[PDB]
């Protein structure tokens, strides 16, 4: 209710809004690379599964 | 009730009415800038929220 208090509130809000958030692009790239890894491993397993019914890999 | 007293009253009124009030343009500009800051932060949060339902930012 005092013009000093509101100015201090504005200053503290400006201080708090400048917090450095963590990097997110690399964080998501981690998940993307893990997805690629899992896909490759599952593809290897599926290919070796196919090599059981017949005696040759695809093509 | 004396012409001297009324003149002194006028002098004191003139003295008191000349008080330098604080600057207000900058005071309001502080709130405007804080509003801009909060809007930007909320926009960042909303964009990262959108990036959850789908896998791309708007446009």
UniProtKB/TrEMBL annotation, chains A, B:
Membrane topology category: Single-pass membrane protein
Keywords: Membrane, Methylation, Transmembrane, Transmembrane helix
Lineage top rank: taxon: Bacteria
Compartmental location: Membrane
Residues annotated as transmembrane: 2-25
A GO BP annotation: protein secretion by the type II secretion system
Classification via SUPFAM superfamilies: Pili subunits
GO cellular component, one term: type II protein secretion system complex
Coiled-coil boundaries: none
The protein, known as: Geopilin domain 1 protein
Lineage start: Bacteria, Pseudomonadati, Thermodesulfobacteriota, Desulfuromonadia, Geobacterales
